[PDB]
Amino acid sequence: VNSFSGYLKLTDNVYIKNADIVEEAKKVKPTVVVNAANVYLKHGGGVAGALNKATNNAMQVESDDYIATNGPLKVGGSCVLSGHNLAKHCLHVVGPNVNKGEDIQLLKSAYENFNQHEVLLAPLLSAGIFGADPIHSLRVCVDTVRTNVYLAVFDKNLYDKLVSSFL
């Protein structure tokens, strides 16, 4: 039993809700919140911009030190950093950005990072400003993630489309 509330169950392990991931994180304080990161951990907009804003820029400060030490992530890769005031940990995961020409096959590799964590609060990878089709992202999530994932979808219209079209 966990503290996530109001989710629709899609499969044995995947749950979905129309919710602002920032507000959901602040309420649940999950062990792991997933950020829709880029390789530079520059949290300017989208989910990353919103999460970072909620940390009063502490996420960005921590991220800049991480990059200065380690260099950029790989597309499809991830790193674990602090969750600040939102979660115990933040798993920064880089889905391919379609508006940069990156291979959509890398989306499965990106979701594989979730399997290293028993339970996660997450957005749909490569959705929103990353330019991929969120219906496809949900399909890859369901077919790749085996751990327990709670997906927060900000846009109500998109949420209804995702549920109504789910196979």
Ligand SMILES: Cc1c(O)cccc1C(=O)N[C@H]1CC[C@@H](NC(=O)c2ccn3ccnc3n2)CC1
């Ligand atoms: C006032 C304030 C603070 O004090 C601290 C932090 C943020 C805000 C603030 O202005 N929040 C607003 C409202 C929520 C917005 N969410 C998104 O853009 C977003 C995009 C994609 N997503 C996928 C799942 N969830 C997602 N959410 C961002 C703008």
